[PDB]
């Protein structure tokens, strides 16, 4: 007899997500809303195919005449236009040759690539993430073997990033270790740097010998396309060496297709071209060579000026419509009578806030109103509509 | 720097050869050295039952949220049907969970990482020779790779007793791998009472059986090319599947595959595949929906799977009659010695028993590429260039 290799595994954890989003599907109220999102909604709740994507959908039904493989790192055209929207257009690293992208499985799978690349071919053991934390970092890291600690960040009492802590915190971090950071939009706080505390970290950065990592899954969500990359650029150019992870998942509405990128910079294209190759090694163990049709859809667009145009405008409306929710948010909760202080909320960016309810007050929202938010109290804005404001804003004055 | 004393990975071969060729000025050059299918214009279409599929995507999309972990369901059992056959006792015990991946390749990784997470495996068998990235695969997940015999170089055949005899190393417990169908690269696969010894033995040595399934339609046809893993599946508690429609459907960039768990029962299954969600999780999150969506579509509609397995039948006849062609062509430009061997071989590539110094000299004097190996793949040949490439074979 043989024991079956399977026979004794203990089953993983249930996806908790997944089973408030089954609450919800169950809840028989038809004023019931759903805050607890992760992805971006549209005024009428939907989460649409955005029309400069059905327009490079059809040009590609159209024109392609194979799906022959890409190349390990992917489209080239693709891999160009990343650089562009990352370091910007005239950019000293790209006239210097100094970066190299490969278009990633989403920006989910730009981590693991990062974290696969580092953990065979550099000395780095620990990953820097902000607390609160994206659940995920610590899965996708810790895959690779790489320990994941928390830097202080959120300041909850206050809903505001508490910089102090973070600089004492991050003392903690060693030369050669990674420091994450998301590039704009912080999820799940939507509280970023300044400008000014951005230069403040990209020096102590350099100082300490971190190597700083962005994730950047929200370009143009917070001010726009060139001001979301500011943060990021103050790093480049001051650093010799970065890693990016960005995904057009969020800004592309291209979630279910898996469009991101890798980017690795160093100090000179020699150094960044044999860095590569080793982030090609782990890319081919992997999956081998991505898949190219969402990326596609990004090139088509990015390297078309009117399809650019179209998408550039959906993208601001996204952007425009996240801000009218949050203006609108504090204001009725203003109208309504919370006769409390609401107004961060209009001081942070993109998709994602704190609430400053308690878990109890989030049990109440769904139990009694059928509002429901995740147990943290982060709520999307996006789930907010002109429709559905007034009576979600009087729930929580409710139970405040 | 973090970077500054990272050692350079060695270079692709495979990349450099095609580089060679692209920057080839010769007019007569020939590539068998691809690793696609090729029809008899020299191109690697989008099949006609895809582009339909894509058109009808097109239309019924109306959000691209992400897809669960697992992928698309249809797309899962849709392939579930393909392996095991519809009615299957296993799909009636419910034995069996899919995942969508990124390819066959992202299934091996998938599997790969599920393993040496959550099990005691520590090795994975391979024949040799076969697919170069078993080995990074396995290798990135920490599992060690060890070969078994399989190919008896001199004779162009399987050497069944090697192969026996060579597993009697493999434990219990350890992973033993095996190619579905198209053995790449020999194109040599067990006859099904070798599958039915192999299947017999495993069960007695207590391997973990793993199937690589890319050519599913190559050999013989659909149902045919799976009564290998179906004689497998007959009497084991457990088997993993990677499957890839890159081949099969020409989805090659979509990045379309699966990674199948078979266990005891359901319960068991359903704990294992709940870990296995979790390596999917910690790597790409979710996989890519055009792709399987295209395969899903066509798979589950009447009139659309009919197209395509006209399409896929048209493939397979095309490289057997490829592979004739080449034989008879040998023979009339006077070879010499016997090639009947590759009227024996299934899918697209064959040894060709060609010594690397041979191989050489068809590249420099002749413009004929084909890899170190001797491996040549048939798809690359055509009624307009099998002459010259015949004629160049004879002079080596």
Same mark, same amino acid.
């Not at 943060?231 to 509405?253: Q, T």
């Not at 399809?307 to 009725?332: G, K, P, S, Y």
């Given at each position: ?29 038809? *004023? #019931?809303?759903?805050?607890? =999102? ?5 005024? $009428?709740?939907? !989460? &649409?195919?955005? %029309? ?35 370091? *910007? #257009?005239?950019?000293?690293? =790209? ?5 190299? $992208?490969?278009? !990633? &499985?989403?920006? %989910? ?35 690779? *073997? ?255």
């Amino acid at each position: 007899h043989h024991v079956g290799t399977f026979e004794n595994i203990t089953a993983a954890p249930a996806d908790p997500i997944l089973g408030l989003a089954d609450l919800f599907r169950a809840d028989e109220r038809p *004023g #019931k809303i759903n805050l607890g =999102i992760g992805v971006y909604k549209d005024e $009428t709740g939907k !989460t &649409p195919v955005l %029309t400069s994507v059905k327009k490079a959908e059809q040009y590609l039904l159209e024109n392609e005449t194979t799906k022959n493989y890409l190349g390990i790192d992917g489209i080239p055209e693709f891999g160009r236009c990343t650089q562009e929207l990352l370091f *910007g #257009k005239g950019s000293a690293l =790209i006239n210097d040759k100094r970066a190299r $992208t490969a278009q !990633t &499985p989403g920006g %989910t799978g730009a981590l693991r690539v990062a974290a696969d690349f580092l953990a065979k071919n550099t000395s780095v053991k620990r990953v820097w993430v902000s607390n609160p934390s994206w659940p995920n970092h610590k899965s996708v890291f810790n895959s690779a *073997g790489l320990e994941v600690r928390e830097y202080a960040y959120y300041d909850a009492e206050n809903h505001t990033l508490d910089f102090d802590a973070l600089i004492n915190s991050l003392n903690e971090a060693q030369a050669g270790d990674v420091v994450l950071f998301h590039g704009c939009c912080h999820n799940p706080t939507g509280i970023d740097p300044t400008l000014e505390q951005w230069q403040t970290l990209a020096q102590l950065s350099v100082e300490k010998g971190w190597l700083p990592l962005f994730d950047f899954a929200y370009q143009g969500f917070a001010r726009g396309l060139e001001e979301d990359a500011e943060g990021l650029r103050a790093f480049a150019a001051m650093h010799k060496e970065l890693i990016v992870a960005s995904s057009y998942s969020k800004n592309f509405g291209l979630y279910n297709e898996r469009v991101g990128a890798c980017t690795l910079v160093a100090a000179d294209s020699e150094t960044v071209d044999r860095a590569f190759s080793q982030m090609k090694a782990a890319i081919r163990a992997n999956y081998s060579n991505p898949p190219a049709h969402g990326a596609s859809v990004v090139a088509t667009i990015l390297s078309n000026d009117a399809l650019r145009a179209i998408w550039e405008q959906e993208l601001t409306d996204m952007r425009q419509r996240i801000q009218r929710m949050r203006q609108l948010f504090v204001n009725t909760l203003q109208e309504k009578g919370a006769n409390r202080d609401f107004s961060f909320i209009i001081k942070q960016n993109g998709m994602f806030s704190f609430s400053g309810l308690t878990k109890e007050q989030v049990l109440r929202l769904r139990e009694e109103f059928g509002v429901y938010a995740v147990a943290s109290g982060r709520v999307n804005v996006a789930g907010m509509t002109p429709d559905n404001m007034a009576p979600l804003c009087e729930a929580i004055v409710a139970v405040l």
